[PDB]
Amino acid sequence: PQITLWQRPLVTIKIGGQLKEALLDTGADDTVLEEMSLPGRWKPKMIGGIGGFIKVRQYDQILIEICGHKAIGTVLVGPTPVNIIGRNLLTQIGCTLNF
Amino acid sequence: PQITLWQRPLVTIKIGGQLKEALLDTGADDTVLEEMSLPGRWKPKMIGGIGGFIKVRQYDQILIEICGHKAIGTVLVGPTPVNIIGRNLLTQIGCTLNF
Numbered sequence: 748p749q750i751t752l753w754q755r756p757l758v759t760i761k762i763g764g765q766l767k768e769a770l771l772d773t774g775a776d777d778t779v780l781e782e783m784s785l786p787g788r789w790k791p792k793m794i795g796g797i798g799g800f801i802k803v804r805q806y807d808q809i810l811i812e813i814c815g816h817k818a819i820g821t822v823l824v825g826p827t828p829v830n831i832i833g834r835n836l837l838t839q840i841g842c843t844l845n846f
Numbered sequence: 847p848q849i850t851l852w853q854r855p856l857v858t859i860k861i862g863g864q865l866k867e868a869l870l871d872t873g874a875d876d877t878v879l880e881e882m883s884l885p886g887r888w889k890p891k892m893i894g895g896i897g898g899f900i901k902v903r904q905y906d907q908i909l910i911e912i913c914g915h916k917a918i919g920t921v922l923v924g925p926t927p928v929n930i931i932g933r934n935l936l937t938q939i940g941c942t943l944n945f
């Protein structure tokens with residue numbers, strides 16, 4: 748698809764058997780989702796921006812489906828005000844910026 | 847251009863006659879630059895980041911060049927982790943996401 752930026756670029760994702768809405772965010776290094784369960788080992792991380800930092804759990808090698816595209820990558824889980832798909836997964840679906 | 851996302855999509859911008867590095871950020875509704883001098887009056891603006899909301903300065907109808915493309919629009923100034931070009935100016939230069 749070609750996604751316009753007149754509005755937030757929101758898409759449906761499937762993860763851990765759950766459907767969620769998430770923002771395609773080229774400014775985000777990492778993918779961060781609201782609190783949910785994921786399988787496997789994790790370790791703590793801090794991520795931050797305007798307003799400060801939050802603590803998240805880092806899960807690696809998680810399967811995700813974004814707009815029909817399958818990918819695998821690290822997912823951070825914690826008290827984010829919005830579900831974010833970051834560059835670590837946008838690369839995997841072949842997402843580019845074009846102007 | 848076509849910009850992939852294996853690294854941060856940093857570009858050169860020009861504002862107030864000066865070159866600066868900024869991040870193209872489709873997750874940001876608005877453009878936010880590090881503390882700098884801009885002409886004219888400003889208005890207050892609240893923006894929501896990963897850790898909470900903060901107050902920034904809003905300047906309207908500011909000339910800014912982004913990767914050589916001319917734009918004129920709203921620029922926020924505040925304690926941002928990096929200069930950010932958000933959707934208000936990405937639309938002006940014709941930027942889309944594609945996969």
Ligand SMILES: O=S(=O)(c1ccccc1)N(Cc1ccccc1)[C@H]1CNC[C@@H]1N(Cc1ccccc1)S(=O)(=O)c1ccccc1
Nearest residue numbers: 772774775776777794795796797873874878895896927930
């Ligand atoms: O400061 S912001 O928070 C910011 C700056 C200008 C305008 C709005 C927010 N922000 C910019 C930014 C933060 C840190 C490093 C580089 C840029 C957010 C806007 N898009 C990316 C970033 N985030 C996504 C986001 C957060 C809030 C709202 C929408 C998207 S995030 O949750 O801080 C995040 C940080 C590290 C890894 C992964 C994600």
Ligand SMILES: [Cl-]
Nearest residue numbers: 819820821835
């Ligand atoms: Cl990853």
Ligand SMILES: [Cl-]
Nearest residue numbers: 838841850851
């Ligand atoms: Cl590629």
Ligand SMILES: [Cl-]
Nearest residue numbers: 919920934935
């Ligand atoms: Cl604008």
